[model samples]
Target: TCPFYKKIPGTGFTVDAFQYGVVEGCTAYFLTHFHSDHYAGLSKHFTFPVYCSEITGNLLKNKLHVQEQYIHPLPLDTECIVNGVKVVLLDANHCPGAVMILFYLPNGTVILHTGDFRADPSMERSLLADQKVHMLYLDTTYCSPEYTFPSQQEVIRFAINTAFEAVTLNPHALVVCGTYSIGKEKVFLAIADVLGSKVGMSQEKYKTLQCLNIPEINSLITTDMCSSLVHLLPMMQINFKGLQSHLKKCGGKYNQILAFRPTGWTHSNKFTRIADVIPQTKGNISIYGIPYSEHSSYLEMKRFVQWLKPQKIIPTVNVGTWKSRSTMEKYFREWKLEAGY
Candidate 1:
């Protein structure tokens, strides 16, 4: 039986600590990603340790700037028996270290829990294979069709396209925005690579994006969700906008700028507000509010449920926010599951 969860709306404070006491002894706090929603409450808790993928291990060690002592870190896909309970980390494409948890009950019941993830055809093809999953605990963040988002590549294209148009309005405009210091950094990197020699980035973004490259890619953290990127904007102004702007403008034309606020969960973008300008600035504005988020959308969630094909699909993350469980049920039915919230 799952413990009673006290849902915290994006706050890093873990309100469900009481639930841990209720479970027939939850041995470990298995983390799915570096997002505060998933990892915030995981600090210094659990009887055994916290489990996550290698990438998550590093982020826990470095990126989140978390000071978690005596926390146990485990590799993904390999199941370990802790307190007679078998646990494995599955591929959660939502972010770099993002993973799904699969627990094997003593009675041979398979419980698959997707913290918050996406099925990236590019990276997760083989990750989903080789599992006869049952009773899937999924990322139903976007269990309704209306809540879906386009592919990351598509979103990047939209961002670049929007930037290109923005630059057209002001030839020297330096666009400034926000993203996680980790994975969402790539959104801006890809933009620069495509617009190479014509684009400039803040040192912070450049340094963070550097990790997304090949050999360094292994070190990159996969943090999903983006609602907190605004906090990092102050630091970028001096380095990304001031110095880098001068360097990128060296060519005959001025350097164009692009910034992305990362909501690792693609659904995170749907809830945030980027601007409150009453005058509705037109083409020259520096910000682009792309629906590039990390959370699962309704369609993506339904598609995932089809693959999990569980007799009972329980959505833990995106409940009662909008249409709530009822909305998820509506889309689940569309996916051919008589299931409703």
Candidate 2:
């Protein structure tokens, strides 16, 4: 579990977690999203009152089963005062129901916790850049210079179009796309809309999507993988061994197989990295790793620092300083906290 949260200076209000930031007593907490890494221990634990978006609150209470009384829905763009600190929620643009927590302290120090977000130019309109920021808690998952990628929409198009083209080469091949259970709905939806066929998914993913109330994606669930032209499987389900076992069991079910893993790991190194495709051949079938990530790219992080210009930057990821310190220096100034915790 990633243990990280910030305490508002001079105020007892805490953001994101009860622990961390001097471990002082907290009056309230903020939850940015339902991602496991962010809300790691909150599931059925930490009953402290939480301030979060309505969807996040629902996911916490109904899905994760955190006590109902602990969740307080904080709507987007609306300013609310907790103790003396003015707080607002802004879209993070990372995934569905994700947000960035912006807290304006009475002391004139503005702190922004960007809970795993990709940079978008339109965010400038929602977030008034004229307000000088004092500190920023950034998500530096891809802070290294080696990390670079194109827009998600364009990558989704590439994935779907490539799947279509691959299937045309061998009409008997099944195109399997990899994703986490909760994310990458856009890929499945786009493939279904363009291909005019329902894609396959596990029961849990289907149920989660059903509860999300997105009709566009709800109709894309298919129970039959054998008959489906395209199937969305959990990343682990179609591992090299998993694929071999499935092929062995089905025998002639599919004449061939083409798989794609849409993730950021494709950009980990300069060598063996393609713009959008990382091909891995296993016997007759092939697995192509695609550059589809929800995290901000290195350029995006640089642009965010340049545009927002926060005085201090603290990375949310555990021990993130060692990996991101040098890269962060290129774009932002450092704010050293008071030594005594």
Candidate 3:
């Protein structure tokens, strides 16, 4: 049996194996969430049973290759006993897959681990009443006080209005946006939520949309939306047009539809490629640009830290980028360290 930890940038724990022993013999185990740090190390073997929330199970099994033999799926607000140790799985809410683990040993020893704790207002019901953990494993990414951001109520449009305006200009155009299927799904819902009754999504997207269970949904638009007006995508500008070009070659015709998220538009040739084809210039092609991000903003990171104060800090990133991690660590430590999870 073993109880070991790996050292990383923001996460208080390490990912790889520690001692050369049977992991199955380890006392009560936990996987905090589905993000890379918590889930990536399952690379070779899930030789022992561990606990994680149910929502992340699909992602783990399908995406991470975590074997079913090792996972014990549990839900929020519950405690379990494994090898005489008590464990709690609570919401971390940094993302849909986040979780925090609390442990109570038979000898009365206490332990805590918070992979990336956050105090999102949306997570009120879970964090408000959680028992005081003895040891808190937290996200120390922003333990310092100098971070801030705009409120959730803030109304800002980072995109140029030229994108939306281009939609109506082309009747033969099928405007499309390419993003991660899930990511683009949210954008579709978010856009549909505000526009209400005015916008639509493709039949494929519409089917997935129903699974989201948002409840306010009524009538939905199908492939017709792709044939007529606009579509938003997460893919790069050139790639999406390639998709449109492919569609056009397959007997699918569109006069000109604007693509969302154009990066370079200063050059005339940037909008269209010159070939043997005559210019069908109804001016049906344009790319709207927007710089959006999915990760927490620096200010949001600070707020997340303020809510979950910890004793030591750690940071985990995709690359383990040392300099960037050091910059964050610099602010966290007060000559030493200001703990935040």
Candidate 4:
């Protein structure tokens, strides 16, 4: 809950602790991704050396106006030494520039800080598969049993099919997708590609995508709203009142609205099938809460911990309350026992 827990014990480094003031003995600041929660307190005034992936560094410089001299962008999947510590950055698969930070300390302690990852199948073949990790700083955002959602690919396929149906039923219906600054691009991109339509977004969002430098996404973006049936907006704009106002501003360009709110929070254990997850419809507007998450699901996290078999597992989220933290640890203990560790 608090950023203090982000500080690595017995080390002069902090991972994603910019919101809090400087740590007493901290020498290096590590950013996992470009999310606001991770880089909240980062500003031009601070003078600490920050290390992150190249895309994240570019975002910090262009969007946050952080000084380039203070930002050190490390190459992906390469071992580099910083302050006498061997560090490696692997693809987090959470967002455009997110990376799992792996550190080899002087005392032979191997620590892997997964800065928000989706335990993709490709991750099973990483360099960590061979190495023995002593401590694992895990992203336990969805570490509970209830969050067992389908894979990102599955959800994306569902979203594309659903959106295609809506458009085919009503050609005048505008397909609005809710997305974050860096994540969830895959959902909208797939929908746009299948529909063969340009995507409408603000100029600011277009600039952010440019930082990502994805050629397909860049080619699909358009500032003109009426030119494209599929529109991309911030998550907050997907609600009834927001969409109502947005449609009014469109001036009859779109008669109906098909909105997609993609996140992990929508999934529950009771859901049996993809279509069983209901949609909320009021008047001519329909909102679908797609279980499209960048974070790893509960089973995915379980598989990750079981395979890694780290000696010490430190959760990085849902630790604000004792009850929540204890519940997560209980799962960890259960998994450890199952693994005979």
Candidate 5:
């Protein structure tokens, strides 16, 4: 239950997924977000009733084909009790529909399951209302000291500025912003709106956005590549396979190509090489890595933990790759110490 989904015994609610290292006889489940990793093994074949944010419920009903009756959409800030537990959802500030699951158990205990989130100051008011978190299931994606970046709003401005300069240098060039399928829509949408162009996505991404029904996103959808100078694409498209076929379709109508990746890894102004793929280079398509991420950075995570002050911190990822359990414990202590918090 530590590395896998956090399973609360006798609570009857499995956090995130059921089959991902969960015990049997789990009748009810809770989803923190619609990310692929959290939604694994969840589909029409699954029969257990689900409790999630309103937007996530809509996604499950339309995208995953889950029945409406079985999907429960809990509104933000409203408390609901299920199986003798009081539950309230708070905005995770990661992506659309992402939420932090807060549980006040029947036996006078409080647990907060942060599926995945970027720290925002506004969340402090709601989270501090209870003033107690007995246990915390943390997302340690950027637990190391190396992860430090500006706020997402600042990074979005950096992305928009980068896009404008790149497109300006090559007037006919198409600016392609790489992103994950589920999150990071705000970066591209913000850039597109600033550039006065529409954003393009694959059919699956389109369907996912459609189900979410984001009101401001309708005018930004376009299937025609020629219709807009800026295009939003998956990471692999701009990072791998060289975007040759797509460029061929352009038929020399456009000049050079420029690509930007909005992610947290670029915080240090450099990226870890992904299978020989460098962060920035000069070629037919120029690429720049921007420090924009949806998860809490080391400083942000440290601040959140200090504020929440959970008695125990349970990591969501496997940290024992080449060490014993105790060694992993020491590793985490070093991580926290390295951040000086």
Candidate 6:
């Protein structure tokens, strides 16, 4: 769930809080990424100055048709002054243009706003390690002990291997993968690269990818459906009926459909191993739920909080209800105590 509040308490900036409709005292609007949930209230007519990564700014211009004047694209790892505050953007490791915003206030307060991130070892080398973060605006999407999954590289390898094995058994299999408008590119991109196949997606999705400006991506993608056997579709279209209709629409170019639905929600604490989370098959169509999450797992989040040791931890997600927030806070307190702080 999205955060109920957007303002970061003391700052005049609103981070991913566009839905509140022109927040008072908000001198600047900081968008973490181009995800719809984060940029919900943003529109073409919006007059406020918006700050984000270069790629996110491009996405806003190309997808949302946002005016160029209002979009401020900031470079990564570089500090820039905005509204009398120093700001820096660090790679979030979640999606292509996603960033973790670091705000240095005038009165020696350091705030780190992780828009949405997948915790990795590389993050330990960032500027966060050098400063004592006073407030951590975290992306607590999977903040519970129950939501542990495999690493992203392991999951991507598993997905590629799964698709390869299926195609080897059935040469005419149409390997369809589910994805959002912006995320999960690496999963299908690896599948296409390893199998030496082109990826098919809607033109709109292609346009969004173009905003990413990935050099190798342009060659692996195609707007024509028949030209490629590996198709990338929205999460809703990966179902049995949806794939059946899609197969029919493709004029029976492929014999059977093998779909991969990649998401973190597919994995739960009940599942001991990754393989235990099985795939559902119905005659010609097979759906495999891969635990490929962009956000950090429970263990990763715990490690991150312990390392940062922020004075105050504020969750940006799973905060809609008091129970949910309390549950998350319990873990935070436990982690803080474990860190001996």
lDDT of candidate 4 at residue 200, scale 0 to 100:
89
Roughly what TM-score does model 5 have, to 2 decimal places? 0.87
Q: Model 4 segments beyond 4 Å from truth?
A: 1-4, 267-269
lDDT of 2 by residue, 193-272 (tens): 67667887667666566555566654677676665677777788667777766666555867677787777656344664
Candidate with the larger lDDT of 3 and 4: 4
Deviation from truth (RMSD, Å), model 6: 1.9
Ranking by TM-score: 6, 4, 5, 2, 1, 3
TM-score of each: 0.66, 0.84, 0.59, 0.95, 0.87, 0.95
Candidate 1 lowest-lDDT run of ten: 222-231
Mark the regions of model 6 whose C-alpha exceeds 4 Å error after superposition. 1-5, 267-269
Clashing pairs in 4: none
Clashes of each: 22, 0, 18, 0, 0, 0
Per-residue C-alpha lDDT of model 4 across residues 1-341, encoded as one tens digit per residue: 33655877667889998876867788999999999988999987879999999999989999998998999999998889987788999999898999999988888889999999998768889888878999999999988888877777788888899999889988889999997768888888889888989888999988898888676665788888878888988899899999999999889988999998887666353566676666899999999888777899888889988988999998888988999999998999999999998
Clash pairs for candidate 5: none
Superposing all C-alpha atoms, what RMSD in Å does each candidate have to the true structure? Answer: 8.3, 4.7, 8.6, 1.7, 4.0, 1.9
Identify the superior model by TM-score, candidate 1 or candidate 2.
2
Q: Give candidate 6's error at residue 78 in angstroms.
A: 0.6
The number of clashing residue pairs in model 3 is 18
Question: Candidate order by lDDT, highest to lowest?
Answer: 4, 6, 5, 2, 1, 3
Question: In terms of TM-score, how similar is model 6 to the real structure?
Answer: 0.95
What is candidate 6's CA lDDT for residue 140?
A: 95
lDDT string, candidate 1, 1-341, tens digits: 34344322122211223234433444445566666645544433333355567677666655444455644566766867755667777667666767776666776666666676775543335545655656655566555555655677777766666655655666565544454445455565454444432223345544444433235432322232121111124334423444355335345334444444444344444554323211123332333445666766656655556655676666676565666777766666676634442
lDDT (10s digit) by residue, model 3, range 233-325: 336433545655634642555556555442211233224322211212224454443323233445555554455454444454322466766
